[PDB]
Amino acid sequence: SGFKFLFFSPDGTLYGVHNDKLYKGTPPTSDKDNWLARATLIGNGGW
Amino acid sequence: SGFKFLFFSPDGTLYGVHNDKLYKGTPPTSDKDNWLARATLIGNGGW
Amino acid sequence: SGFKFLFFSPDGTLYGVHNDKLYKGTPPTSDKDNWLARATLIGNGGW
Amino acid sequence: SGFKFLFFSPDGTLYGVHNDKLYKGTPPTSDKDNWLARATLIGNGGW
Amino acid sequence: MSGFKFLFFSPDGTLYGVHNDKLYKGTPPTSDKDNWLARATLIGNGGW
Ligand SMILES: CC(=O)N[C@@H]1[C@@H](O)[C@H](O)[C@@H](CO)O[C@@H]1O
Ligand SMILES: CC(=O)N[C@@H]1[C@@H](O)[C@H](O)[C@@H](CO)O[C@@H]1O
Ligand SMILES: CC(=O)N[C@@H]1[C@@H](O)[C@H](O)[C@@H](CO)O[C@@H]1O
Ligand SMILES: CC(=O)N[C@@H]1[C@@H](O)[C@H](O)[C@@H](CO)O[C@@H]1O
């Protein structure tokens, strides 16, 4: 459904695997902060 | 039932995914601490 | 009978979810250290 | 397929377990960055 | 269940892992020849 992995890098950046893709970005600060919309895609498949 | 993810950011904040929602807050100090009630909701759905 | 989550806080404390309860304590240093018996309960239920 | 574990060390190295094998490397920086292709194999079996 | 159950770092850079209900720690492996479970410190036996 949602994320397969969700975890932090030691610099404070949030990482997530969603639909076999890897994303990173600063963690959301409120429910009005759409994280996936602004996260950087860093893995297109295989995760 | 319980949490899907439960993990720390490097600044010491506890993060958790519960019923597809993302929460954060200082970790509970004791079993008198209703963490889910006081945690900040930072994502509603999709986690 | 085992743990659902087992992870570190950035200050070096070990956290664990066991039997729906959340526990914390310094990590064990030898197999003679019964960690769960000495760990601090910081959440009863919902984890 | 996919990863079983995917997590950071405090020095910023990404680690991953894929098909019983353990890999490490600097995290991928764009969707053109094939992480598993350049990651260092540090465990063949047992993970 | 197969392989490890948990595999994760402490903030001082030590690798921890749960394997066959036992908890192990050690410096992370350095190559595909490094037999980690043979050299890792057993710090918990049962219940993990
Ligand atoms: C996985 C993800 O980025 N989810 C967010 C959700 O948390 C947030 O509340 C919503 C606001 O419209 O946007 C997205 O759905
Ligand atoms: C997930 C969560 O926040 N659980 C807590 C539990 O840890 C705590 O013991 C109780 C106190 O009344 O409140 C909540 O149930
Ligand atoms: C879990 C574990 O320690 N696995 C290692 C494996 O990574 C390594 O390639 C092999 C070398 O002989 O020894 C062990 O099987
Ligand atoms: C989860 C937990 O605390 N397990 C410990 C185990 O690690 C240790 O080897 C044993 C004997 O001291 O006591 C407990 O079973």
Residue numbers in the entry:
A (entry chain A), B (entry chain B), C (entry chain C), D (entry chain E): 2 to 48
E (entry chain D): 1 to 48
Recite the paper's sentences.
Pent is a cationic (pI ∼ 8), designed β-propeller pentamer that binds one N-acetyl-d-glucosamine (GlcNAc) per monomer. Pentagonal proteins, which cannot adopt planar tessellations, are good candidates for forming pseudospherical enclosed arrangements such as dodecahedra or icosahedra. Synthetic macrocycles can mediate porous protein assemblies in the solid state, including cage-like structures (e.g., space group F432).14−17 The anionic sulfonato-calix[n]arenes (sclxn) are particularly useful mediators. Here, sclx8 directed the assembly of a pentameric β-propeller into a discrete icosahedral cage, evidenced in solution (i.e., a closed oligomer as opposed to an extended or infinite assembly occurring in the solid state).
Lys33, highly exposed on the Pent vertices, is located close to the 2- and 3-fold symmetry axes of the icosahedral assembly suggesting that the anionic calixarene can glue these sites. A crystal structure of Pent and the C6-symmetric sclx6 provides supporting evidence for this inference. Like the Pent–sclx8 cocrystals, Pent–sclx6 was cocrystallized in 1.2 M ammonium sulfate and 0.1 M sodium malonate pH 7. These crystals diffracted to 1.7 Å resolution, and the structure was solved in space group C2221 with an asymmetric unit comprising one Pent molecule. Four sclx6 ligands are evident in the unbiased electron density map. Adopting the “double partial cone” conformation, sclx6 binds the solvent exposed loop residues 30–34 at three of the Pent subunits. Consistent with our hypothesis, multiple noncovalent bonds are formed between the sulfonato-calixarene and up to 5 residues including Lys33 (and/or Lys22) from two protein subunits of two Pent molecules. The macrocycle position at the pentamer vertex suggests that sclx8 might form similar interactions in assembling the icosahedron. Potential calixarene binding sites were revealed in the Pent–sclx6 crystal structure, obtained under similar conditions.
